[PDB]
Design a protein around this motif. Structure first.
Motif, PDB file in Angstrom:
ATOM      1  N   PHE A 133       0.735  -1.241   0.000  1.00 26.69           N
ATOM      2  CA  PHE A 133       0.000   0.000   0.000  1.00 26.69           C
ATOM      3  C   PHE A 133       0.778   1.313   0.000  1.00 26.69           C
ATOM      4  CE2 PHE A 133      -1.756   3.272   2.632  1.00 26.69           C
ATOM      5  CZ  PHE A 133      -2.892   3.580   1.952  1.00 26.69           C
ATOM      6  N   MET A 137      -0.104   4.120  -2.706  1.00 31.58           N
ATOM      7  CA  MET A 137      -0.625   5.367  -2.223  1.00 31.58           C
ATOM      8  C   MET A 137       0.253   6.517  -2.613  1.00 31.58           C
ATOM      9  SD  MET A 137      -3.194   6.471  -1.058  1.00 31.58           S
ATOM     10  CE  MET A 137      -3.681   8.144  -0.794  1.00 31.58           C
ATOM     11  N   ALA A 138       1.531   6.292  -2.577  1.00 31.38           N
ATOM     12  CA  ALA A 138       2.475   7.294  -2.919  1.00 31.38           C
ATOM     13  C   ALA A 138       2.367   7.623  -4.361  1.00 31.38           C
ATOM     14  CB  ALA A 138       3.861   6.839  -2.578  1.00 31.38           C
ATOM     15  N   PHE A 145       0.219  15.415  -6.727  1.00 29.37           N
ATOM     16  CA  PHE A 145       1.225  16.305  -6.125  1.00 29.37           C
ATOM     17  C   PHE A 145       2.142  16.993  -7.143  1.00 29.37           C
ATOM     18  CE2 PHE A 145       1.202  13.781  -1.854  1.00 29.37           C
ATOM     19  CZ  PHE A 145       0.122  14.526  -1.398  1.00 29.37           C
ATOM     20  N   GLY A 176       2.739  10.391   4.750  1.00 26.00           N
ATOM     21  CA  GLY A 176       3.064   9.304   3.902  1.00 26.00           C
ATOM     22  C   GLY A 176       4.538   9.344   3.645  1.00 26.00           C
ATOM     23  N   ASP A 197       4.186  11.090  10.238  1.00 23.65           N
ATOM     24  CA  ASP A 197       3.458   9.842  10.032  1.00 23.65           C
ATOM     25  C   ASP A 197       3.827   8.871  11.138  1.00 23.65           C
ATOM     26  OD1 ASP A 197       2.535   7.371   9.412  1.00 23.65           O
ATOM     27  OD2 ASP A 197       3.164   7.296   7.395  1.00 23.65           O
ATOM     28  N   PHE A 198       3.000   7.877  11.384  1.00 23.39           N
ATOM     29  CA  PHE A 198       3.272   6.885  12.403  1.00 23.39           C
ATOM     30  C   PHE A 198       3.944   5.660  11.856  1.00 23.39           C
ATOM     31  CE2 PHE A 198      -0.946   4.417  12.478  1.00 23.39           C
ATOM     32  CZ  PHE A 198      -0.846   4.229  11.148  1.00 23.39           C
ATOM     33  N   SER A 199       4.146   5.637  10.557  1.00 26.07           N
ATOM     34  CA  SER A 199       4.874   4.581   9.851  1.00 26.07           C
ATOM     35  C   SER A 199       6.388   4.845   9.898  1.00 26.07           C
ATOM     36  CB  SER A 199       4.373   4.525   8.403  1.00 26.07           C
ATOM     37  OG  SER A 199       5.066   3.572   7.632  1.00 26.07           O
ATOM     38  N   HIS A 223       5.320  10.375  14.764  1.00 23.59           N
ATOM     39  CA  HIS A 223       4.372  10.493  15.876  1.00 23.59           C
ATOM     40  C   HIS A 223       3.032   9.916  15.453  1.00 23.59           C
ATOM     41  CE1 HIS A 223       7.278  12.996  17.875  1.00 23.59           C
ATOM     42  NE2 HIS A 223       7.146  13.994  17.017  1.00 23.59           N
ATOM     43  N   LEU A 225      -0.743  10.835  15.281  1.00 27.51           N
ATOM     44  CA  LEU A 225      -1.458  12.120  15.261  1.00 27.51           C
ATOM     45  C   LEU A 225      -2.482  12.313  16.379  1.00 27.51           C
ATOM     46  CD1 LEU A 225      -2.123  12.412  11.411  1.00 27.51           C
ATOM     47  CD2 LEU A 225      -0.132  13.292  12.746  1.00 27.51           C
ATOM     48  N   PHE A 240      -3.301  15.244   3.741  1.00 33.39           N
ATOM     49  CA  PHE A 240      -3.768  14.729   2.443  1.00 33.39           C
ATOM     50  C   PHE A 240      -4.248  13.293   2.535  1.00 33.39           C
ATOM     51  CE2 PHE A 240      -0.826  18.150   1.241  1.00 33.39           C
ATOM     52  CZ  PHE A 240      -1.577  18.833   0.306  1.00 33.39           C
ATOM     53  N   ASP A 241      -5.566  13.125   2.562  1.00 35.32           N
ATOM     54  CA  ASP A 241      -6.208  11.804   2.615  1.00 35.32           C
ATOM     55  C   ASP A 241      -5.676  10.966   3.773  1.00 35.32           C
ATOM     56  OD1 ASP A 241      -7.949  11.591  -0.109  1.00 35.32           O
ATOM     57  OD2 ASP A 241      -6.019  12.511  -0.648  1.00 35.32           O
ATOM     58  N   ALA A 242      -5.697  11.549   4.962  1.00 38.21           N
ATOM     59  CA  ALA A 242      -5.282  10.887   6.178  1.00 38.21           C
ATOM     60  C   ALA A 242      -6.320  10.837   7.273  1.00 38.21           C
ATOM     61  CB  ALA A 242      -4.039  11.529   6.707  1.00 38.21           C
ATOM     62  N   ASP A 245      -9.045   7.620   7.781  1.00 33.96           N
ATOM     63  CA  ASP A 245      -8.521   6.360   8.225  1.00 33.96           C
ATOM     64  C   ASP A 245      -7.917   6.366   9.597  1.00 33.96           C
ATOM     65  OD1 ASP A 245      -6.167   7.469   7.382  1.00 33.96           O
ATOM     66  OD2 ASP A 245      -6.330   6.461   5.479  1.00 33.96           O
ATOM     67  N   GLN A 246      -8.063   7.466  10.301  1.00 31.45           N
ATOM     68  CA  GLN A 246      -7.549   7.566  11.633  1.00 31.45           C
ATOM     69  C   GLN A 246      -8.427   6.776  12.528  1.00 31.45           C
ATOM     70  OE1 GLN A 246      -4.723   9.102  12.297  1.00 31.45           O
ATOM     71  NE2 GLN A 246      -4.790   9.549  10.178  1.00 31.45           N
TER      72      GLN A 246
HETATM   73  N1  LIG Z   1      -2.625   7.469  13.671  1.00 31.80           N
HETATM   74  C1  LIG Z   1      -1.785   7.980  12.775  1.00 31.80           C
HETATM   75  N2  LIG Z   1      -0.750   8.749  13.138  1.00 31.80           N
HETATM   76  C2  LIG Z   1       0.092   9.252  12.144  1.00 31.80           C
HETATM   77  N3  LIG Z   1      -0.189   8.926  10.815  1.00 31.80           N
HETATM   78  C3  LIG Z   1      -1.245   8.149  10.529  1.00 31.80           C
HETATM   79  C4  LIG Z   1      -2.031   7.684  11.501  1.00 31.80           C
HETATM   80  N4  LIG Z   1      -2.987   6.951  10.937  1.00 31.80           N
HETATM   81  C5  LIG Z   1      -2.796   6.962   9.621  1.00 31.80           C
HETATM   82  N5  LIG Z   1      -1.721   7.702   9.371  1.00 31.80           N
HETATM   83  C6  LIG Z   1      -1.151   7.979   8.034  1.00 31.80           C
HETATM   84  O1  LIG Z   1      -2.212   8.090   7.074  1.00 31.80           O
HETATM   85  C7  LIG Z   1      -1.555   7.923   5.810  1.00 31.80           C
HETATM   86  C8  LIG Z   1      -2.583   7.534   4.746  1.00 31.80           C
HETATM   87  S1  LIG Z   1      -1.953   7.726   3.039  1.00 31.80           S
HETATM   88  C9  LIG Z   1      -0.671   9.002   3.314  1.00 31.80           C
HETATM   89  C10 LIG Z   1      -1.151  10.415   2.973  1.00 31.80           C
HETATM   90  C11 LIG Z   1      -0.083  11.132   2.146  1.00 31.80           C
HETATM   91  N6  LIG Z   1      -0.314  12.583   2.131  1.00 31.80           N
HETATM   92  C12 LIG Z   1      -0.102  10.597   0.713  1.00 31.80           C
HETATM   93  O2  LIG Z   1      -0.949  11.087  -0.065  1.00 31.80           O
HETATM   94  O3  LIG Z   1       0.731   9.710   0.428  1.00 31.80           O
HETATM   95  C13 LIG Z   1      -0.600   6.763   6.042  1.00 31.80           C
HETATM   96  O4  LIG Z   1       0.621   6.996   5.325  1.00 31.80           O
HETATM   97  C14 LIG Z   1      -0.327   6.803   7.537  1.00 31.80           C
HETATM   98  O5  LIG Z   1       1.067   7.065   7.762  1.00 31.80           O
END
Ligand SMILES: Nc1ncnc2c1ncn2[C@@H]1O[C@H](CSCC[C@H](N)C(=O)O)[C@@H](O)[C@H]1O
Ligand SMILES: Nc1ncnc2c1ncn2[C@@H]1O[C@H](CSCC[C@H](N)C(=O)O)[C@@H](O)[C@H]1O
Lengths: 350, 353
Positions: A133, A137-138, A145, A176, A197-199, A223, A225, A240-242, A245-246
């Motif tokens: 993914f 996603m990137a 972008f 991301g 990002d938390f990844s 960190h 979020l 951006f599209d985050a 899915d939190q």
């Molecule tokens: N709880 C959290 N804390 C920090 N980042 C989170 C998170 N939950 C989801 N994310 C971020 O949500 C992102 C979704 S896609 C990444 C968005 C980026 N702007 C792009 O367009 O590529 C994931 O990369 C993940 O790192």
């Protein structure tokens, strides 16, 4: 409709489903690329061009041919990719290449069984079960972008461009792989950017590109979020599209409000759709949106005992949730460049 | 003439469609489609409780199902329905007619896309061992079809076959697999003697247990590699169901079927209904699906073994030619109107010694 009609419809669907997969394969193999750079040709000619096993290619061409993307001359026994179509499935088409999004069909298929288990058992499927993914996603994100961030998206906020040029502290939440941050950091040398990002993967990736380009004004931090100590630290924050899915989206939206200095600005780009179902019927991509939400965006949230709003949370909910976070000045924008997302602009009083 | 603006829309619809498939594939596996057929308009909550499933998941599923147009939605009362005309083709109650079954294959092909792509680059193929969920599913749905029509529809196609089996004749089924075929025939024809051949020991043992359990003396099973058979004038009748195109060495197998038959014997080979000419397949439903399972499965599994890799869509013209290469100078190709996915090639062996 009557019965005969459904089966036709539903059979066609299965054929379309297969077609999708075939396109994704053409993308990842550069067949679609190679063919756009080619005249009419034989299976063996096309395999040779692409540096691939003809046999695999031959069958690929079959499926593409029956699906009416590719064209095959029965007489000459050569295949051809119509140009009007190649500019909708090739890397060179930039943002217009639809072959990217088909990659998600396979990626979602990979977890059908783990997902069906949650129907029975609850919980959800974690991010670590979707290794592929981040790259998709990137790429999917990267298209918009490079095409539009700096010259189309940032200018939607009056004076933001000027501000960046002057110098400002800017943060990308849910960054991301740090693409947007990289673009902005080169574009505005007087501004300092931080992506979060938390990844480890994403931070590693974003963290790396900057090391490579020597962009001092770009910095990356890992960190979650939902829990942050940033108070009044950023003039501008993008996400951006985050949000959908939190696990704890409302909390992240509170956490964004706190980290903005007064008079600061939030730019949240999230999916365009209604929070009401009826309003999404017969709109293109809705079925795809609900699917991904069920198989990805909806489940990854739930796996952490999260909110699970999904991809299709919509406009109505999204806005009133910005209201709830403290954003009293909220406006919604769109751009031709990106059909998928709304561009929510939200301001904090001085 | 199609316009680029137009293609974009068609292909986006395609994108929507793939998702719609997966949703149905999920709906069937979950038992959701079955469940709704048995309900009056109800709410996401009612439907989830009725099915014994998590409402939130049911809700996301319902939404896509609604947008895809399969499921209908009264926003006024927050209820959904599955129209009877549609319920009919997606419910387990349709037995073999359930379309929903075939949708499951989108995820199954999904699961191997990355390995398949690598193959383009490096040759070889994806081993049969990586497709267990795929195999078990095919066999489950064939099995229904056999239950549905093998005795009363399929065997009668071969003129004078019901009598031969009634009187009692020596029969073998190659690539028997699960063995459902062998059971039904041996039930309906106590006079005849059956042998099931497959090289998966698991299948062979399985069948033997099933045979004994049902107390069928006539049923028998053996593990052989079809390509390595030494059998000579053993069987009056040989039936092969959809197991030729996947072979590593299909030509040999056909040569071995000729040899195993007695003079006056008959081969019934059931396989896919398609042309060997690409042109002929465009505009015919499911062509795309088949070329896909072939690249994605049927073709590669063979190639993995340095096989022929004829594929799912080897077609009729090539199949017939191959039979003749094998030795059959008397071959008729039958179709049943109800079945549109298969050709029933009836090949006869010469009577002289
Ligand atoms: N709880 C959290 N804390 C920090 N980042 C989170 C998170 N939950 C989801 N994310 C971020 O949500 C992102 C979704 S896609 C990444 C968005 C980026 N702007 C792009 O367009 O590529 C994931 O990369 C993940 O790192
Ligand atoms: N080389 C071989 N020798 C013996 N069996 C083979 C074989 N290659 C493939 N098969 C058989 O091909 C079967 C897959 S298809 C099974 C057909 C079955 N009669 C049905 O319609 O359900 C496997 O069970 C395997 O046993």
């Amino acid at each position: 409709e009557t019965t005969e009609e459904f089966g036709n419809r539903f059979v066609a669907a299965i054929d379309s489903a297969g077609l999708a997969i075939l396109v994704s394969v053409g993308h990842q193999t550069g067949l679609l690329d190679t063919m756009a750079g080619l005249p009419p040709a034989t299976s063996m000619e096309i395999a040779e061009a692409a540096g691939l096993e003809e046999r695999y290619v031959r069958e690929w061409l079959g499926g593409m041919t029956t699906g009416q993307i590719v064209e095959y001359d029965a007489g000459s026994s050569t295949y051809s990719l119509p140009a009007h179509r190649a500019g909708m499935l090739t890397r060179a088409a930039g943002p217009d290449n639809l072959a990217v999004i088909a990659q998600f069909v396979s990626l979602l298929g990979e977890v059908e069984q783990k997902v069906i288990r949650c129907f029975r058992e609850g919980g959800g499927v974690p991010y670590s079960e979707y290794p592929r993914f981040h790259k998709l996603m990137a790429e999917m994100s990267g298209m918009v972008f490079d095409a539009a961030l700096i010259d189309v998206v940032l200018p939607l906020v009056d004076g933001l461009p000027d501000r960046l040029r002057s110098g400002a502290d800017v943060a990308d939440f849910g960054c991301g792989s740090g693409r947007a941050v990289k673009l902005m950091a080169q574009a505005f040398g007087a501004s300092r950017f931080t992506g979060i990002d938390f990844s480890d993967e994403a931070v590693a990736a974003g963290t790396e590109e900057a090391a490579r380009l020597g962009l001092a004004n770009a910095t990356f931090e890992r960190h979650d979020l939902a829990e942050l100590d940033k108070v009044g630290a950023y003039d501008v924050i993008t996400v951006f599209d985050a949000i959908h899915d939190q696990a704890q989206p409302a909390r992240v939206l509170q956490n964004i409000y706190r980290a903005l200095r007064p008079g600061g600005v939030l730019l949240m780009v999230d999916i365009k759709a209604s929070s009401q179902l009826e309003d999404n019927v017969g709109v293109p991509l809705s079925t795809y949106l609900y699917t991904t939400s069920l198989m990805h965006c909806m489940t990854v949230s739930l796996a952490l005992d999260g909110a699970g709003l999904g991809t299709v949370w919509g406009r109505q909910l999204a806005t009133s949730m910005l209201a709830d976070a403290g954003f009293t000045d909220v406006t919604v924008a769109e751009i031709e460049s990106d059909v998928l997302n709304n561009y929510y602009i939200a301001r904090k009083l001085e």
